[PDB]
């Protein structure tokens, strides 16, 4: 690579110490693969090893490329974007384009190798410090820090930011309707273009960078997959936040109108404009559960006045920039998950679900695995920044099984949840 | 003179302090002298220097005699001084566990004399090490020294020495990569499968090297011999366990008593199968001075005396063997307590250990049996690098309808059942749909939180309706009430209808124990039902609820 003039100096918020953080235990062949990668990083002059008097650590896993047989080598920035992108959102921040949600189309293409090519600020390298760890602390870990522009870390793209612009600058000239942001390592490239044409545009991009110097190895399966859904594709213009349905059924019972008060007082903290007030006489002195109650005209003058009060969306629900995302899910058995994305409780900005296949294919870490995926992709593409999750899981568990499902280069921050009881029914 | 040539580390003091000031006039002429002939002796092997007023720093200067009388020692106080120097990476947190060694012919210990004072200490520092023996009462120009290798108790000393002693190792463990060398505090400990002859030269060629380095190794032989006493271990050539426990008897336990017995008993639990603290620690619930004396009860001093006749005879733990399976395998011990072996050969375990659910007021056994084989998958990968196959005492159905019906996500490796009982069973499932032809029970419970009354009822719709005191209770606890008191009162098959969510809340989460008793007793009812329903309705939305105070 080369060395372009001097290095971007980057500096902290002042009383802001380096990152320490602890590294996870790892499968040995996680180790020996990490290994690997970082002995050929060592010679081709990315990272050098380091003393005891670099007391700093992130954090750092393997995954595996996107689709390929090939190991891959994660590191978990949080801690360092946290303690620098905040004033690096700042002072090199990059701008988030509102239109990129309209496209019908929207590719993900990685660019993550360029920032390799760029030295970084000598100053500055102690802080990228990780640790390939030792199985049974036989040894004291592997020490490295980088010496140029690190995969993950939020810095990279903001320093590298003139440079893709510049790059682009051609691409965007002749495509003036092309939408394109860069979110750390991947580059968003949204289009209106039927998906042929959005397809050979993006190749058009692929061979442009290329020819610029970017490789990006994200490319496909070539001239014959044997069975593949090839393109990685978005349609952002679909979507939006999922009304809530309630039960269409002919006849209904005393259990089942119960089900639906009670959901629809559920409700009510959402949607102000809800009366339950002509179900609740429905049945009134008790009853056997599976006694068949008549639904009057009144009553279903009350039922179809609160279905179509439920499919417009809500007033007031604005998206704060101040505020953090946040994402929970909740699990629907079946393969099916449900999900939203709120800032203050009860405004959704977004809400979702997402399934996959049911059985004999996937188990319940890996289609959470591939949820939060799912669903922080739509926040970078929405918001550009990502939600913090809560998870339905045993912070062990996922902490263990994370990073075998784990397919993307950027990591969300996420904390664990024992709570929620009855929104299952409520929100499927 | 046991200095060396080994590249200092570069280190600074924390950004925007200084140097040590601390002055020491104090105090007496028979330690006083008694520092020079230490200091001399220290300067002839390079390790400090004389220094001159030019103001520097200082730090304070202790002396005292070793253990038996014999030799002197000298102390220095680095507080202030480590205080100010900057942080270093974390030398070592855990230590290696012997279950996660491999076998090897021949292994030797060797420990490193002078240590730290072989290694040479960054330049520009030094001066920070400044420190003053003063004279007799008579204020002269006492003597100022200063470090030019690492001192005892710097705050840098330790990590600086592992990296330096990994250097110099580097260039013999290229020459000799079929021994292995692991390097721990002052100590190294060597292995290797080199036939006894081979072995026994190359250690002394390893002693040779570290020597030309600076760095003294033990003479007389090799020293020590199997065991072998580490850390609390006793490792001999073909297997390890713990160093002998001493459970002590007495008439009164203070809480420190009982933390140590706790503890004693926990690092017993790795290899000696069985062990339970559960009830001995539930006397160390309440957190309180560590002097106060606690009664033991008795279901505690039974336990003490489950692990005393345990403890009785010895048990071995064996070493590591790459190429055969790991297995892990997980016994109910029946107290909401799990215990566990992991082997690769039937009747000799790697290790051993124990499970217990310390948070949640209610638990169910399918799900601490899954937080087990959690800890147990942690564990294994930090040992050993793997995850063990496991051996649990499950029915696949009873697993598959638990975690498919489990709002949390849940994951386990592969796992064969073994029919050692106690199994692990689901006692009793609620109806996912109303009964037909059955009772329906409106219940509902409230309290007054002044008085801690209340009562606790139902209505049902066959007009039978019920109505029952309660004393010393909550709302929650009365709602709990009245769901107990529906299951009393009805048949084999019953539909429940609730006001709250405390109370399905914790039904439905299925529990099969509980530390409240009426849970319990709830619990027992719910199995010895074949039908129950449980129905969720808003409180106060006037629908079937109760009406009574
Ligand atoms: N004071 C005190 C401390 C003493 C002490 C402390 C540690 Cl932590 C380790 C140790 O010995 C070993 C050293 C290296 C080794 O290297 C093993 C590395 N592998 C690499 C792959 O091939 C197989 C070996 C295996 C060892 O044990 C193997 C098992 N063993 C233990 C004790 C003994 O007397 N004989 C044995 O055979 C000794």
Not at chain 2, 228 to 236: A, K, N, Q
């Amino acid at each position: 690579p080369i060395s372009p003039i001097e290095t971007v100096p980057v500096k902290l918020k002042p009383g802001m110490d380096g990152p320490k953080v602890k590294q996870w235990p790892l499968t040995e062949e996680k180790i020996k693969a990490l290994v690997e990668i970082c002995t050929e990083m060592e010679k081709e002059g990315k990272i050098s090893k380091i003393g005891p008097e670099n007391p700093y650590n992130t954090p750092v896993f393997a995954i595996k490329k996107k689709d390929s047989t090939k190991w891959r080598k994660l590191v978990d920035f949080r801690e360092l974007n946290k303690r620098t992108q905040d004033f690096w959102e700042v002072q090199l921040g990059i701008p988030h384009p509102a239109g990129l949600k309209k496209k019908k189309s929207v590719t993900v293409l990685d660019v993550g190798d360029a920032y390799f090519s760029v030295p970084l600020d000598e100053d500055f390298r102690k802080y990228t410090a990780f640790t390939i760890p030792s199985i049974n602390n036989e040894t004291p870990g592997i020490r490295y820090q980088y010496n140029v522009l690190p995969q993950g870390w939020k810095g990279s793209p903001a320093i590298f930011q003139s440079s893709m612009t510049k790059i682009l600058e051609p691409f965007k000239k002749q495509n003036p309707d092309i939408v394109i942001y860069q979110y750390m390592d991947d580059l968003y490239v949204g289009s209106d273009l039927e998906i042929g044409q959005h397809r050979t545009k993006i190749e058009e991009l692929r061979q442009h960078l290329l020819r610029w110097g970017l490789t990006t190895p994200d490319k496909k399966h070539q001239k014959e997959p044997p069975f593949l859904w090839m393109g990685y594709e978005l349609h952002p213009d679909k979507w939006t936040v999922q009304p809530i349905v309630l039960p269409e059924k002919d006849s209904w019972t005393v259990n089942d109108i119960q089900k639906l008060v009670g959901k629809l007082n559920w409700a009510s903290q959402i949607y102000p404009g809800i009366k339950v007030r002509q179900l609740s006489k429905l049945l009134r002195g008790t009853k056997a559960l599976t006694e068949v109650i008549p639904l009057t005209e009144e009553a279903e003058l009350e039922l179809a006045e609160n279905r179509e009060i439920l499919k417009e969306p809500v007033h007031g629900v604005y998206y704060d920039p101040s505020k953090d995302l946040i994402a929970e899910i909740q699990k629907q058995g079946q393969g099916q998950w449900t999900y939203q994305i709120y800032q203050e409780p009860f405004k959704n900005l977004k809400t979702g679900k997402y399934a996959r296949m049911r059985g004999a294919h996937t188990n319940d870490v890996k289609q959470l695995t591939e949820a939060v995926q799912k669903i922080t992709t739509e926040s970078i593409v929405i918001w550009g920044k990502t939600p913090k999750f809560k998870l339905p899981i045993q912070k062990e568990t996922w902490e263990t099984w994370w990073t075998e499902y784990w397919q993307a280069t950027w990591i969300p921050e996420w904390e664990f949840v024992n709570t929620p009881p009855l929104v299952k029914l409520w929100y499927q | 003179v046991p200095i060396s040539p080994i590249e200092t580390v570069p280190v600074k003091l924390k950004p925007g302090m200084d140097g040590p000031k601390v002055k020491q006039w104090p105090l007496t002429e028979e330690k006083i002298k008694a520092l020079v002939e230490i200091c001399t002796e220290m300067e002839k092997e390079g390790k400090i220097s004389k220094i001159g007023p030019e103001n520097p720093y200082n730090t304070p200067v202790f002396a005292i005699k070793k253990k038996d009388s014999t030799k002197w020692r000298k102390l220095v106080d680095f507080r202030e001084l480590n205080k100010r120097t900057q942080d270093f990476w974390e030398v070592q947190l855990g230590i290696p566990h012997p279950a996660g060694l491999k076998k090897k012919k021949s292994v030797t210990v060797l420990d490193v004399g002078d240590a730290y004072f072989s290694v040479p200490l960054d330049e520009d520092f030094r001066k920070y090490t400044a420190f003053t023996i003063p004279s007799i009462n008579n204020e002269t120009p006492g003597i100022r020294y200063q470090y030019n290798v690492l001192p005892q108790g710097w705050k840098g000393s330790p990590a600086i020495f592992q990296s330096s002693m990994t250097k110099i190792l580097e260039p013999f463990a290229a020459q000799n990569p079929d021994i292995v060398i692991y390097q721990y505090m002052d100590d190294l400990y060597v292995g290797s499968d080199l036939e006894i002859g081979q072995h026994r030269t190359k250690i002394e060629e390893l002693r040779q090297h570290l020597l030309r380095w600076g760095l003294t190794t033990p003479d007389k032989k090799h020293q020590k011999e199997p065991p072998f006493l580490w850390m609390g271990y006793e490792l001999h050539p073909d297997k390890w366990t713990v160093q002998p426990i001493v459970l002590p008897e007495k008439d009164s336990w203070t809480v420190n008593d009982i933390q140590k017995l706790v503890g004693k008993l926990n690092w017993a639990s790795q290899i000696y199968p069985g062990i339970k603290v559960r009830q001995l620690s539930k006397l160390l619930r309440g957190t309180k001075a560590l002097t106060e004396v606690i009664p033991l009860t008795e279901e505690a001093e039974l336990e003490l005396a489950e692990n005393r006749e345990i403890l009785k005879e010895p048990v071995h733990g064996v070493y590591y063997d790459p190429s055969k399976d790991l297995i892990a395998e997980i016994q109910k011990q029946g107290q909401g307590q799990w215990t566990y072996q992991i082997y690769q050969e039937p009747f000799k375990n790697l290790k051993t250990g124990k499970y217990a659910r310390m948070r949640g007021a209610h638990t169910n056994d399918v799900k601490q049996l899954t937080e087990a084989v959690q800890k147990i998958t942690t564990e294994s990968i930090v040992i050993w690098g793997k995850t063990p196959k496991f051996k649990l005492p499950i029915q696949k159905e009873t697993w598959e309808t638990w975690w498919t019906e489990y709002w949390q996500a849940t994951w386990i490796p592969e796992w064969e059942f073994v029919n050692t009982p106690p199994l692990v069973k689901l006692w009793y499932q609620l109806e996912k749909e109303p009964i037909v032809g059955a009772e329906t029970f409106y219940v509902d419970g409230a309290a007054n939180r002044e008085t801690k009354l209340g009562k606790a009822g139902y209505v049902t719709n066959k007009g039978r309706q019920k109505v029952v005191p309660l004393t010393n209770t909550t709302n929650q606890k009365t709602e709990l009430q009245a769901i107990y008191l529906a299951l009393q009162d009805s048949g084999l098959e019953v539909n429940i209808v609730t006001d709250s969510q405390y109370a399905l809340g914790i039904i439905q989460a299925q529990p099969d124990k509980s530390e409240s008793e009426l849970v319990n007793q709830i619990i027992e009812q719910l199995i010895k039902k074949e039908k129950v329903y449980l129905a969720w309705v808003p409180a106060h939305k006037g629908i079937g609820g109760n009406e009574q105070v």
